[PDB]
Design a protein around this ligand. Structure first.
Ligand SMILES: [Mg+2]
Ligand SMILES: [Mg+2]
Ligand SMILES: [Mg+2]
Ligand SMILES: [Mg+2]
Ligand SMILES: [Mg+2]
Ligand SMILES: [Mg+2]
Ligand SMILES: [Mg+2]
Ligand SMILES: [Mg+2]
Ligand SMILES: [Mg+2]
Ligand SMILES: [Mg+2]
Ligand SMILES: [Mg+2]
Ligand SMILES: [Mg+2]
Ligand SMILES: [Mg+2]
Ligand SMILES: [Mg+2]
Ligand SMILES: [Mg+2]
Ligand SMILES: [Mg+2]
Ligand SMILES: [Mg+2]
Ligand SMILES: [Mg+2]
Ligand SMILES: [Mg+2]
Lengths: 116, 94, 58, 77, 136
RNA sequence: GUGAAGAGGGAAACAACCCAGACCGCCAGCUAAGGUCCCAAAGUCAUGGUUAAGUGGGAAACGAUGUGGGAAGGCCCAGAC
RNA sequence: UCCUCCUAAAGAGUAACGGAGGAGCACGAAGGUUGGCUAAUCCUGGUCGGACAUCAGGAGGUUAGUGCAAUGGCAUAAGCC
RNA sequence: GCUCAACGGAUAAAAGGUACUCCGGGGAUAACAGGCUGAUACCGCCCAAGAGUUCAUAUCGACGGCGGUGUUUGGCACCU
RNA sequence: UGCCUGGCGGCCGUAGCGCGGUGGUCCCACCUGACCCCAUGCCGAACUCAGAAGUGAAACGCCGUAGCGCCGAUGGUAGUGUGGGGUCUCCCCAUGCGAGAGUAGGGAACUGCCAGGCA
């Protein structure tokens, strides 16, 4: 399995963020898309979600699923969660190496007012 | 073709079972899935003589409790460890 | 509401320490002593514990 | 014949504060050798796997986990 | 002489002997010699009662021994004071509770089986009885 | 748990076992363990059975047409042993 | 003198000239953190090659591993880079 | 800076003979005798493979089992 | 409101493995290419970047099937606290608690928060 090996590759960081009782910004990546959503410290319910599959974001994007696309969703997540009062989150890799579109997804969200 | 008479046990447990066994009777139960199980008591000397027959465990038996005939089949038998006696016999409502 | 009468009929010389305390809980002092206690599931739990030295009339 | 007669002092392990007990902060809950009881919510873990409180409350034992492992937590009640 | 090879430990606690036995029915053959008493039954009595059985029938049937000692018994030497270690293991016994089926054999008429088991029941300390196969 | 540091009654006698905890006196009553034929206080008490051994009132593997009770079995007045 | 298991009677503790084994160290990385990885044993196929080296598939599942005895533990790995 | 390892470590520094012996104590503890036990010892019995020309029990009796006595060698340390 | 799909949990085998069928508009998955951002103790196999041609084969989801896994009564048995008793190296009686194994059977999950596509 290619996904199961990644899931156990992100368990340690994901359970520490729950024991820490901190809001986290989980990031899911696909060869054709990229997703992001802010999940409450409970872990069961979400507060804010923005992704490339959203039609309000994809129509302005030449090809959803590249670095320039990951920068646009990160800005969307940060501004959406800014009016909700969420400012202090913690980034969750979800097993992906913090090197490509996830880095741009975080960097653009970080620059758009979110503090993590 | 084997017909055996039994009565419904008023009291059950470890203490009440050993009083039954000292009076030449031993407990038994009848369970058949879609009906509630029925705990009965029946004499020991009568049923020990029939259970020696090879056909006891194969043939469908008949139990007369409260006047009603219940057709059963012998499922399991609990024997005394070192005596020619019985302790408990399971009838399934077949 | 209803009172219950307990009488001690056997001595407490060589009894377990958990049965000497139950008699103190009930209030019995010597064999033949009769006390009138309130009826209660807790009180009747002491009578059951020592129901070989006490005799309850009812 | 002989060549025996050795032992070690008992380490006095075991649960110290059982379930439902009101503990303070930092009070030891269970002394263990391996990890028989895993740290849950509001309890820590020593270098020798001793489980200690981190906030005053009532102890709780639970069996959360995919592998059905005993967990110890604290309710700030 | 029945005796375990490659035991985990040389010497074993005395222990006790309570309760009824587990193998209380004939499962391999058709006639069985069932105990009614209680007490340890050494490996020397197991072989002495097997010889008296493979000689009464002497040509026919198989014989199953449903017991195995696997219990070391240690005896102190003579003119030795108490203490200073445990005794050195001497023989092996098979703890027997009532209901245990010791021997059993198939392939002979019941009359020959009944008499053959009587020749072995006179070499075992415990009080044994003859039992036949059932149906369940 | 008792003795040690606890007497009293019982187990013939018998610190530990069973009953029971002595502040003192009484020529008063009811009981516990244990007992009621005489020694020695109290049933030669009542009903229904067992034992023939003084078993009761020392001990096993094993042996036996001792004797009482219970459920079945084989043969038998086309006559059993 | 110290450490691990049993005796130790499911909290702690618990003895014998009771039943079994270890220690008087090691490491400047064998510690910290970040990133990554998952074994034993089997089958089949394959040059030297062989019951057993290295390789490719499948079953298996931690029956492997832990600087050092035993117990408890470990996949979020405390095991391996 | 201590195998002060007899590891809560009497000194910085230490082996023996006594039948030539002596004092304070102990039946808290051994040798003799007694006592409890009976592994061991002696005696007896149960089953019967065989020996006995046939035939197990005239006479023995293997492999095993069950007891008695308190006469051996022992165990304990209750009395002195 | 309904169906399909993705993310995060709850719950932990009645929830997993096996056998068969089915799904590609969207989603997911395989996939094309590699100078570049990054990587292989060799290999873009994995990780990663740039895209969309092909496919639903593998994987994944869903549905069906009990061959295993798993859950599992009633009755009885073992054990045992207290109080009595025996022929007391083991048991019995009164009473309270009452397994394990096995039998009948159950059974191929249920559910919460968001985000897409369709009707
Ligand atoms: Mg006295
Ligand atoms: Mg007197
Ligand atoms: Mg007084
Ligand atoms: Mg009177
Ligand atoms: Mg008189
Ligand atoms: Mg006499
Ligand atoms: Mg303990
Ligand atoms: Mg205990
Ligand atoms: Mg003590
Ligand atoms: Mg290490
Ligand atoms: Mg790591
Ligand atoms: Mg490490
Ligand atoms: Mg010292
Ligand atoms: Mg000193
Ligand atoms: Mg001289
Ligand atoms: Mg001289
Ligand atoms: Mg002197
Ligand atoms: Mg003395
Ligand atoms: Mg002494």
């Amino acid at each position: 399995d290619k996904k199961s090996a990644r899931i156990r590759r992100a368990t340690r960081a994901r359970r520490k963020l729950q024991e820490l009782g901190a809001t986290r910004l989980v990031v899911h990546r696909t060869p054709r898309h990229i997703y992001a959503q802010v999940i409450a410290p409970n872990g069961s319910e979400v507060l804010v979600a923005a992704s490339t599959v959203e039609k309000a974001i994809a129509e302005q994007l030449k090809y959803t699923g590249n670095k320039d696309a990951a920068a646009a969703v990160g800005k969307a997540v940060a501004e959406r969660a800014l009016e909700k009062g969420i400012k202090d989150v913690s980034f969750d890799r979800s097993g992906f190496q913090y090197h490509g579109r996830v880095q741009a997804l975080a960097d653009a969200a970080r620059e758009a007012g979110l503090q993590f | 073709m084997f017909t055996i008479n039994a009565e419904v046990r008023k009291e059950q447990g470890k203490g009440a079972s050993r009083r039954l066994r000292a009076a030449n009777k031993f407990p038994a139960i009848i369970y058949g899935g879609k009906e509630a199980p029925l705990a009965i008591e029946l004499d020991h000397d009568k049923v020990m003589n029939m259970q020696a027959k090879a056909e006891f465990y194969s043939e469908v038996l008949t139990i007369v409790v409260d006047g009603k005939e219940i057709k059963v089949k012998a499922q399991d038998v609990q024997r005394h460890p070192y005596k020619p006696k019985l302790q408990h016999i399971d009838f399934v409502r077949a | 509401a209803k009172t219950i009468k307990i009488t001690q009929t056997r001595s407490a010389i060589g009894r377990l320490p958990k049965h000497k305390a139950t008699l103190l809980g009930l209030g019995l002092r010597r064999i033949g002593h009769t006390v009138e206690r309130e009826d209660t599931p807790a009180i009747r739990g002491m009578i059951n514990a020592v129901s070989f030295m006490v005799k309850v009339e009812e | 014949s002989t060549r025996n007669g050795r032992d070690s002092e008992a380490k006095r392990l075991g649960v110290k504060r059982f379930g439902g007990e009101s503990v303070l902060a930092g009070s030891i809950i269970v002394r263990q050798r391996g990890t028989k009881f895993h740290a849950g919510a509001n309890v820590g873990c020593g270098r020798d796997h001793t489980l200690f409180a981190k906030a005053d409350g009532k102890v709780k034992f639970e069996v959360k986990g995919p592998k059905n492992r005993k967990f110890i937590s604290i309710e700030a009640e | 002489m029945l005796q375990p090879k490659r035991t985990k430990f040389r010497k074993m606690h005395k222990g006790r002997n309570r309760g009824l036995a587990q193998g209380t029915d004939v499962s391999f053959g058709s006639f069985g010699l069932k105990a009614v008493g209680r007490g340890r039954l050494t490996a020397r009595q197991i072989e002495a009662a097997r010889r008296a059985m493979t000689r009464a029938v002497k040509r026919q049937g198989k014989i199953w021994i449903r017991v195995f000692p696997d219990k070391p018994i240690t005896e102190k030497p003579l003119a030795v004071r108490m203490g200073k270690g445990k005794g050195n293991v001497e023989y092996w016994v098979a703890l027997i509770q009532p209901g245990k089926v010791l021997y059993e054999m198939d392939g002979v008429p019941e009359e020959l089986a009944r008499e053959a088991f009587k020749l072995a029941a006179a070499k075992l300390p415990i009080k044994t009885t003859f039992v036949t196969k059932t149906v369940m």
